[PDB]
Amino acid sequence: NVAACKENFQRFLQRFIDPLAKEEITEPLYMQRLGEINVIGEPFLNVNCEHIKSFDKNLYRQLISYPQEVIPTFDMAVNEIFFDRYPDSILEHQIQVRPFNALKTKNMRNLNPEDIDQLITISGMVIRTSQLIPEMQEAFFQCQVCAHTTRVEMDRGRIAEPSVCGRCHTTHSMALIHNRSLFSDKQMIKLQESPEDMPAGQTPHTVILFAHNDLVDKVQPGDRVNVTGIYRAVPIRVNPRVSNVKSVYKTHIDVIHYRKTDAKRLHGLDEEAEQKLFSEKRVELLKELSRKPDIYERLASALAPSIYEHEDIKKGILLQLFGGTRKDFSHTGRGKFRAEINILLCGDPGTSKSQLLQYVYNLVPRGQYTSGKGSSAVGLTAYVMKDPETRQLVLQTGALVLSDNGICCIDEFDKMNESTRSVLHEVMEQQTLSIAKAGIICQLNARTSVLAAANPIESQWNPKKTTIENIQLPHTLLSRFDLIFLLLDPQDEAYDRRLAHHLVALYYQLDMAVLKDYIAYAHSTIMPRLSEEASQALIEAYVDMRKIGSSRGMVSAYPRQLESLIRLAEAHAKVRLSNKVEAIDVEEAKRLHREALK
Amino acid sequence: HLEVRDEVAEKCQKLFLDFLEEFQSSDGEIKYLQLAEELIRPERNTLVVSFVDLEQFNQQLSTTIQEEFYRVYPYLCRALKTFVKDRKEIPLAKDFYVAFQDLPTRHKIRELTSSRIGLLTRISGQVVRTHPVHPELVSGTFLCLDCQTVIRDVEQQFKYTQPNICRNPVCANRRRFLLDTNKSRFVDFQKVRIQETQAELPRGSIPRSLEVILRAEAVESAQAGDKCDFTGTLIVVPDVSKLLSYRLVFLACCVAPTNPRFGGKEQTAESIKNQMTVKEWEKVFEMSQDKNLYHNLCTSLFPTIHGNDEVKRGVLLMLFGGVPKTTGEGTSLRGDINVCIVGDPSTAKSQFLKHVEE
Ligand SMILES: [Zn+2]
Ligand SMILES: [Zn+2]
């Protein structure tokens, strides 16, 4: 069973060819993988245990049925085909093998006891993790008489005491020395089945996974993964004293491989090292698309290809996905400087606000969606809970802190009593949060960016009143926003006709990976610095704003707006990869700031 | 039959005992023979050896400490009980402790894997709680019960451990010994909890925490709210209720603030005018003699605020403080002044406060 399988696996690893494409025939597929493993670190080999289903079918029966008596063979049979690069580079740990599956195999509700201890794949949404837990591997005993130190191994899954000192023979003198033994790591994680793929009218389950030595911190709460690993069940004891174990076992999953393919979202900020992992064939594409005279309007108009025109709101929500530069003000003692853009959408009903939030929330990774009455003051920022076991008050994070890199869509912004609305004043302007409660005195921080939607008071935009009276928000809160979009839309007989003609079409029947990669690039390798010709159009653009907004009674302008222009101007330069702010990048993001309140 | 020479430990003990005497400072005058002087008056029992100097004097040693720091700690402390017998006034059963400092390389509370147990690391964090101080039994002296002898020098490991063998061929109770408690050896023991510092938090994460165990004359250095910088070894600890389950614990030996505002060592005009380095004191004098000082602290404290010249002055006079007096009856006059600002939107109110607090 052991020798008969490495011989059959090496063949696979050597002679395999696929009708597929990788990294955008080079026959030695897994030998090329094994070469890459040698040119860099990271001694793991991600094998797809379906390729081994084409090449063979009598190991693919024994890999998903005796996985713990096979995967060691799959390590050994890779160490030897590493002969090509043995002398060249000599790493230390070992080479590894990690079967997986592109597509899931089961749910969390159809795990049956004919599947105990055999490879299994599920999918879910990690809820919470834990801190590391040691786990002994090699004991280390020592006698009190002979003071002789033997080192017994854990082979089957338990540690046996020798009870005879190889020198003095006192028949029990061998204590166990803890901190001289060898330990390994172990983490406990909880999945939660996705809303899709669950029965009619039911509540999500959870499943406990156990990570191990190297996978120990490779996932975060809030991630959607495709875990692959063995499925085990261990007994439990009714007393922690007697050996009377129960008869109903308890199951978990010894994870073996993760996979976070989130193509429905963009790129999270764990892949900044992975931006250097772009095909140079692609950087040409991006740099060339960034030269067309209107790449702004060509990318913007590709957001949410179901909303009708609304041309400006998509401009704003596109500049929000880039944000101003991240300058480093630690020297001037000023503190830090917000670089993300907060957008407010106000306008009479039916104008498709909540659809834009529902679209963004499903686009950006690390986001949240909240509402008006179903969210409290402390549930948005940070609460203090009586931890159940230890009976102690411990801190937790709300919604505005769980996002932290992304967008916190807050629908129904009007219908939040003024208490829970005055909480956003801190987290949305300084990017911080200062907590001082019973035993907890700390100061969090986050890099969120609100995107709120409200209705006018009376829910009807009556043009008799003044703009600062249909909104009915204070000034110490309207100034923390910098793009207040008034969707003033009546019954334009032409607009209604065009919209209906568009909506009906959805009943008969640019790319993403351009945008999904353009964004990662424009985040990784761009930092627009102002100029002197741009800086000289930014001063007057604020001295006129005052005289304008003073009289009309619409919305006054405080010096904070002069920073927003910066935030907007720079954010425009990033769209075209210009790496330097010039004049036009101020006129554009000034016309945008002016022609939104009209 | 006789015990085994733990050679890697005793050779290190010997070389450390040599280093303690040979190493000298810039002017001869062996330095660990004068810091070890105050080590005799009561309540002092920790010598603080810098680690960078142990790098100068030797390097085949530093790589033994920094890799076996738990094997060879019980010997680097005996090699301090012999080096200090040259004083003759120490109680003969007193015991001393070595406390390193100034390690080269730092770490983070999230880099404390399980591949680090038993080594010598260095950690920075905040401080959340501080439990009270206790005694802890390091080596009990079991007064035998039937023999009326004294079984002696028995080491405990996280439990009471009840050694059960007597050197008397007639010991009717290999399961009964009443230990004394007026000869045994105790050491202080405080257990505090530290929380990951702010500048290390990965974005979108709740800060972790671990237990550190101060175990010496170092027992109340860290208080709650401080940002100390601990340097000890990571150890594993069982669950003594069933003596398994293990949990990680930091076993600190030295603790010092993370960034000393005055790098000398850490309360009237003279005590402070002593620590003033030559340039420090020739600059403070220059300022105190400066004219128009009251206009170069405003212009130098709030450099990015045009105007409100009557607010910066008040803020300064708030920072300097008045004279706090205590009336003879028992009351007390308030010494420091309070200041409130009230104004239109966006007039640089929160900017004065952020300036002052940073
Ligand atoms: Zn023995
Ligand atoms: Zn006895």
Curated annotation (Swiss-Prot), chain A:
Early fractionation of eukaryotic MCM proteins yielded a variety of dimeric, trimeric and tetrameric complexes with unclear biological significance. Specifically a MCM467 subcomplex is shown to have in vitro helicase activity which is inhibited by the MCM2 subunit. The MCM2-7 hexamer is the proposed physiological active complex. Acts as a component of the MCM2-7 complex (MCM complex) which is the replicative helicase essential for 'once per cell cycle' DNA replication initiation and elongation in eukaryotic cells. Core component of CDC45-MCM-GINS (CMG) helicase, the molecular machine that unwinds template DNA during replication, and around which the replisome is built. One of its GO terms (biological process) is mitotic DNA replication initiation. It is linked to Immunodeficiency 54: An autosomal recessive disorder characterized by severe intra- and extrauterine growth retardation, microcephaly, decreased numbers of natural killer cells, and recurrent viral infections, most often affecting the respiratory tract and leading to respiratory failure. Affected individuals also have adrenal insufficiency requiring corticosteroid replacement therapy and may have an increased susceptibility to cancer. Residues 295-504 form the MCM domain. Its EC number is 3.6.4.12. It catalyses: ATP + H2O = ADP + phosphate + H(+). Belongs to the MCM family. It comes from the Eukaryota. The keyword Nucleotide-binding applies. The lineage of its organism: Eukaryota, Metazoa, Chordata, Craniata, Vertebrata. This is DNA replication licensing factor MCM4.
Curated annotation (Swiss-Prot), chain B:
The modification Phosphoserine is found at S205. ATP binds at H306, S346, T347, A348, K349, S350. It is found in: Nucleus; Chromosome. Coiled coil: none annotated. O-glycosylated (O-GlcNAcylated), in a cell cycle-dependent manner. Changing D188G: Found in a patient with intra-uterine growth restriction, developmental delay and autism spectrum disorder; uncertain significance. Early fractionation of eukaryotic MCM proteins yielded a variety of dimeric, trimeric and tetrameric complexes with unclear biological significance. Specifically a MCM467 subcomplex is shown to have in vitro helicase activity which is inhibited by the MCM2 subunit. The MCM2-7 hexamer is the proposed physiological active complex. Component of the MCM2-7 complex. The complex forms a toroidal hexameric ring with the proposed subunit order MCM2-MCM6-MCM4-MCM7-MCM3-MCM5. Component of the CMG helicase complex, a hexameric ring of related MCM2-7 subunits stabilized by CDC45 and the tetrameric GINS complex. May interact with MCM10. Interacts with TIPIN. Interacts with CDT1. Interacts with MCMBP. Interacts with DDI2. Belongs to the MCM family. Acts as a component of the MCM2-7 complex (MCM complex) which is the replicative helicase essential for 'once per cell cycle' DNA replication initiation and elongation in eukaryotic cells. Core component of CDC45-MCM-GINS (CMG) helicase, the molecular machine that unwinds template DNA during replication, and around which the replisome is built. This is DNA replication licensing factor MCM6. The lineage of its organism: Eukaryota, Metazoa, Chordata, Craniata, Vertebrata. The chain holds residues 15 to 411 of 821 of the full protein.
